[PDB]
């Protein structure tokens, strides 16, 4: 079932109980993520704006995709990472000579034509105060469709265009969980941010909660955390049920199972990622490429 990654040993990383039930697997080719990402840095630096030693998908120990998609087909690892960083870019901008990223697009056809077209096609595209309302919004402000299109490719999945409607209704709890996670850890980031624009609000669950619940910062977190834990289960439920219906795509069922590790992945990464954790430094290896190599 798994041939491109190893389980990470639990006594070596912190989970904060925020993914009870999921192994942690590392892609066993993580340095491909390194190189795919950094090229994107260079390309960005090259073609649209300054970009050196950027805090995105890379972590000194846990880099995102290496740990969020650890069974990704090795040959495809770089370009995916290349994508994700660009994604991680195009976000910072949200919170020219850039159409030239078809070289990326082109890169994919050379590998998997159909998977590419989907994914590409798949890539067709505030101030909330009650959680019930936010959840719809953020579940895409985090990038459901992107990630979808992303993983399918790297796993070379083909799902028939009809389950498309279905699939998303399965991974609600999932996408829900990770949204909150980001909002927990991207919180100070995204918090200091709203402080600058002069915003009265922060488009972040923590802020919503504080409003919806008359509570302070601390109060918002505990709840959110209490919640994440519960959407975890809610999704885990699904697995067991869905484990054996053949009207379900082999691929979908794969894709579902694969989502587990994005969750576990998100945790450890976000607990480390220089992106959310400035104090965090990279690898010798990681840097040696950023400063000099690649």
Tell me which stretch binds Mn ion (CB under 5 A): 83-91, 117-125, 127-135, 205-213: 83-91
- Comparing C-alpha atoms, which of 161, 162, 207 is closest to residue 184? 207
Q: Does 192 bind ligand NRD (CB under 6 A)?
A: no
25: β partners: 7
Q: Are 232 and 177 in contact (CB under 8 A)?
A: yes
Q: Is 182 left (phi over 0), alpha (psi -120 to 50) or beta?
A: alpha
Choose, by CB under 6 A, the member of 75, 95, 114, 130 that binds ligand NRD.
95
Which CB, 179 or 286, lies closer to ligand NRD? 179
Work out which of 118, 152, 182, 286 binds Mn ion, going by CB under 5 A.
182
257 binds, among Cl ion, ligand NRD, Mn ion, none (CB under 5 to 8 A by kind): none
Distance of closest approach, residue 224 Cβ to ligand NRD, in angstroms:
14
CA 26 centroid distance within chain:
14
- Residue 239 to residue 260: CA distance in whole angstroms: 9
| Near Mn ion by CB under 5 A: residue from 66, 181, 186, 249 | 186
Torsion angles phi and psi, residue 25, rounded to 5: -115, 140
- Length of the chain equals 294
Residue 16 contact among ligand NRD, Cl ion, Mn ion, none, beta carbon within 5 to 8 Å by kind? Cl ion
Binding residues for Mg(2+): 91, 95
Binding interface with ligand NRD (CB under 6 A) = 91, 95, 141-143, 147, 182, 186, 190
């Amino acid at each position: 079932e798994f041939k491109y990654s190893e389980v990470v040993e639990p006594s070596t990383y912190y989970t904060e109980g925020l993914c009870e039930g999921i192994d942690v697997r590392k892609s066993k080719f993580t340095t491909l993520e390194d190189r795919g990402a950094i090229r994107a840095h260079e390309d960005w630096n090259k073609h649209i704006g300054p970009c050196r030693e950027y805090r995105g998908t890379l972590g000194p120990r846990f880099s995102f995709i290496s740990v969020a998609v650890p069974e990704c087909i090795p040959e495809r690892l770089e370009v995916i990472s290349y994508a994700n960083e660009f994604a991680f870019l195009h976000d910072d901008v949200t919170d020219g000579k850039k159409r030239i990223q078809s070289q990326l697009f082109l890169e994919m056809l050379a590998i998997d034509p159909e998977c590419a077209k989907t994914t590409m096609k798949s890539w067709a595209r505030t101030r909330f105060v009650e959680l019930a309302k936010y959840i719809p919004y953020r579940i895409m402000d985090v990038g459901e469709m992107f990630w979808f299109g992303l993983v399918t490719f790297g796993l070379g999945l083909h799902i028939p265009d009809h389950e498309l409607e279905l699939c998303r209704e399965l991974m609600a709890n999932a996408w829900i969980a990770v949204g909150l996670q980001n909002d927990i850890w991207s919180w100070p980031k995204e918090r200091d941010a709203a402080t600058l624009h002069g915003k009265d609000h922060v488009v972040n669950a923590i802020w919503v909660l504080m409003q919806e619940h008359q509570t302070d910062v601390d109060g918002a977190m505990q709840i959110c955390r209490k919640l994440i834990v519960e959407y975890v289960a809610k999704y885990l439920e699904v697995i067991e049920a869905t484990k054996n219906d053949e009207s379900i795509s082999l691929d979908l069922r794969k894709y579902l199972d694969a989502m587990l590790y994005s969750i576990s992945g998100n945790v450890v990464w976000s607990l480390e990622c220089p992106r959310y954790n400035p104090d965090v430094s990279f690898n010798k290896t990681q840097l040696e490429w950023m400063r000099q190599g690649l």
